[PDB]
Amino acid sequence: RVCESQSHKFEGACMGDHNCALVCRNEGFSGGKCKGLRRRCFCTKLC
Amino acid sequence: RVCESQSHKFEGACMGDHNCALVCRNEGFSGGKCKGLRRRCFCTKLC
């Protein structure tokens, strides 16, 4: 089961899922991706 | 740090946040609330 949390560190429009994943790993998550028309980085991990 | 996961048990459209919270507690989360244009139940817990 997957849980999500918006990144605290990601700056600017999320244009590249991989960059978001890397920032999210620095925040303690397993990965992440960009979501929405607002292009925000959302970190993911197993609940 | 809070995380979110769409409910796996909640039936249909989410009207009452309290109902969603109780359903989500049965899924092992601390709470939950109805969100989105298509009113769905999202469970929350500390990650």
Q: Residue B27 in 3-state DSSP?
A: coil
Closest chain A C-alpha to B35 CA, distance in angstroms: 15
Experimental method: X-ray
Farthest CA pair distance, chain A:
28
Q: How far is A1 from chain B (nearest CA, A)?
A: 8
Q: What is the structure's resolution, reported in angstroms to one decimal?
A: 1.3
| Spatial separation of the C-alpha atoms in residues A10 and A41, rounded to whole Å | 7
DSSP H or E stretch at residue A20? helix A17-26
For A31, half-sphere exposure in the C-beta direction (CA atoms, 13 angstrom radius) is 6
Are A47 and B27 in contact by the 8 Å Cβ rule? The answer is: no
What's the rounded Cα separation, in Å, for the pair B45 and B4?
7
**Residues on chain B touching A3 (C-beta within 8 angstroms):** 3-5, 45, 47
Residues in A closer than 8 angstroms to B8, CB to CB, are: 1
